[PDB]
Design a binder for this molecule. Structure first.
Ligand SMILES: [Mg+2]
Length: 563
């Protein structure tokens, strides 16, 4: 109850860069490096003005992976010693990334610390992540993560209450009296799901969804949390409140090692869900990543809704969702490599479409300007301005709301969509661990080729299709809110028929770089829109590999992953 504040001398580390997704390291790094976690937590809290700490609340929680609770205890001991007045912590330390964003905004917290490495594996031999969100409920922007890093590199001591221990398992308020400090340190343990469920209860029509999911003629669903943080949310919202049978909740017990697998939703990492769906018994399936901000959507027989189409379908049926009936649609956005399916809906309904570089900050900026209602990313990301993170379970309830109004199968909705708007066939080729010098040379040579005055207007044939270059550039974005200019965001080959090829190159890691090749082939012919996507995409894939000389530059004859 009564705990001393002490100062611990420490030695700085040089690599504690918080990034856009948080600081991620192997669990063993956190465990084997003295004061690695403590240094970073202190560096985060040192960005808060001492004058504002006593009245500050930080929201703290994470995805359940191994080392989470130890990290949360460290956060409490250091926050208390530094004069932070209050932590709000999910029970057992569990809060999904959307729940943290929800709670920060609801209670007007100064920010939050999220213990997640998202889709990356967890366990004693896995990864651990520490993510900092600020008072709008969203990721800390570059100016703040830069400051955290700078503090991190020269820190020589931190303040900690070594004897402070939070009971994470019991709801309610725990007060800690600090030696020679007048005001107490307060920890509120909250139910992990309540505030987030109460938010969804206002966004969606739970009465309609209960009727959809309960009884004999119910929509049958299988919702796979991949042993990660969304598990209790599925059970308490979809099963207990909305009445889906308990077997609807798949892998919905959080596990410290996510069951020994990557909690990353795609057709192969969630192969178990796909195989379940292939039996034809269920109408709808979905999978979430480890912290719940990404989602994969499946139909009957395992029909795959690609994420670029998913956001377009939600846009096209958006007033099935009570939230948007009330706010109206303020704008649509997608990352630049995401397929142009959303644009077709925006153009037809005459709503602004913002095409942003990859990254949350561009969406958050537009949402904060009241210009963005619905956003999507080809990397299994979908969100709205209800919070300032993407939200996988929200996307599922959006889909369920649309199924309830349309009274059609997932696949029939997509087929109707393609008939109405045409189809953006879409795939992403990932070339992993490529040698970075050759990959960079590939990009620079391709960019030079695209910059030549004769490149626009050039025609590529294969085999029954002629593509004509309409525009070719290295994508640049001037942010209309904060004035920043983002350059070198991706090579775009834009064709007169609505199709595109996009190349992006990752930064260089210890195993090399990743080349991302996105192929977006637009088709309106009824005899073409229901064909196999990799068959319909083969012409543009051939053109992309030829013009980039990817095989010649990298030695790769095939991508590592196809999505
Ligand atoms: Mg995630």
């Amino acid at each position: 109850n009564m705990v001393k504040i002490v100062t611990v001398k420490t030695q700085a580390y040089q690599d504690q860069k918080p990034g856009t997704s948080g600081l991620r390291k192997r669990v063993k790094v956190f465990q084997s490096s003295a004061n690695y976690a403590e240094n970073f937590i202190q560096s985060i809290i040192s960005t808060v003005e001492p004058a504002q700490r006593q009245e500050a609340t930080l929201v703290v929680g994470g995805d359940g992976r191994f080392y989470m609770k130890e990290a949360i205890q460290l956060i409490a001991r250091i926050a208390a010693a530094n004069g932070i007045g209050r932590l709000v912590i999910g029970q057992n330390g569990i809060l999904s990334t959307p729940a943290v964003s929800c709670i920060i905004r609801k209670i007007k917290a100064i920010g939050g610390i999220i213990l997640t490495a998202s889709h990356n594996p967890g366990g004693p031999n896995g990864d651990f992540g520490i993510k900092f969100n600020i008072s709008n409920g969203g990721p800390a922007p570059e100016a703040i993560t830069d400051k955290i890093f700078q503090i991190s590199k020269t820190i020589e001591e931190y303040a900690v209450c070594p004897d402070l221990k939070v009971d994470l398992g019991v709801l309610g308020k725990q007060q800690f009296d600090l030696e020679n400090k007048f005001k107490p340190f307060t920890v509120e343990i909250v139910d992990s799901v309540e505030a987030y469920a109460t938010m969804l209860r206002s966004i969606f029509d739970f009465s309609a969804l209960k009727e959809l999911l309960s009884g004999p003629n119910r929509l049958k669903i299988r919702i796979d949390a991949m042993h990660g943080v969304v598990g209790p949310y599925v059970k308490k919202i979809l099963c207990e409140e909305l009445g889906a049978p308990a077997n609807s909740a798949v892998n919905c017990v959080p596990l410290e090692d996510f069951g020994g697998h990557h909690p990353d939703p795609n057709l192969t990492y969630a192969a178990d869900l796909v195989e379940t769906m292939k039996s034809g018994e269920h109408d709808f399936g979905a999978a979430f990543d480890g912290d719940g901000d990404r989602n994969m959507i499946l139909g009957k027989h395992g029909f795959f809704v690609n994420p670029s189409d998913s956001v377009a379908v939600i846009a096209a049926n958006i007033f099935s969702i009570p939230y948007f009936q009330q706010t109206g649609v303020r704008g649509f956005a997608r990352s630049m490599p995401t397929s142009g399916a959303l644009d077709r809906v925006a153009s037809a309904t005459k709503i602004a479409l913002y095409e942003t570089p990859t990254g949350w900050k561009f969406f958050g900026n537009l949402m904060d300007a009241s210009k963005l209602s619905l956003c999507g990313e080809e990397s299994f990301g979908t969100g709205s301005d209800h919070i300032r993170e993407k939200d996988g379970l929200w996307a599922v309830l959006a889909w369920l709301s649309i199924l309830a109004t349309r009274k059609q199968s997932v696949e029939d909705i997509l087929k109707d969509h393609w008939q109405k708007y045409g189809r953006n066939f879409f795939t992403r080729y990932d070339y992993e661990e490529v040698e970075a010098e050759g990959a960079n040379k590939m990009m620079k040579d391709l960019e030079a080729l695209m910059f030549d005055r004769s490149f626009v207007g050039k025609q590529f044939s294969a085999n029954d299709k002629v593509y004509t270059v309409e525009k070719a550039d290295n994508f640049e974005y001037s942010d209309p809110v904060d004035g920043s200019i983002s350059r070198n965001q991706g090579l775009r080959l834009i064709f007169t028929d609505g199709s595109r090829i996009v190349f992006r190159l990752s930064g260089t890691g210890s195993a090399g770089a990743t080349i991302w090749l996105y192929i977006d082939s637009y088709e309106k012919d009824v005899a073409k829109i229901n064909q196999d996507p990799q068959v319909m995409l083969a012409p543009l894939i051939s053109i992309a590999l030829k013009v980039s000389q990817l095989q010649e530059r990298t030695g790769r004859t095939a991508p590592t992953v196809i999505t």
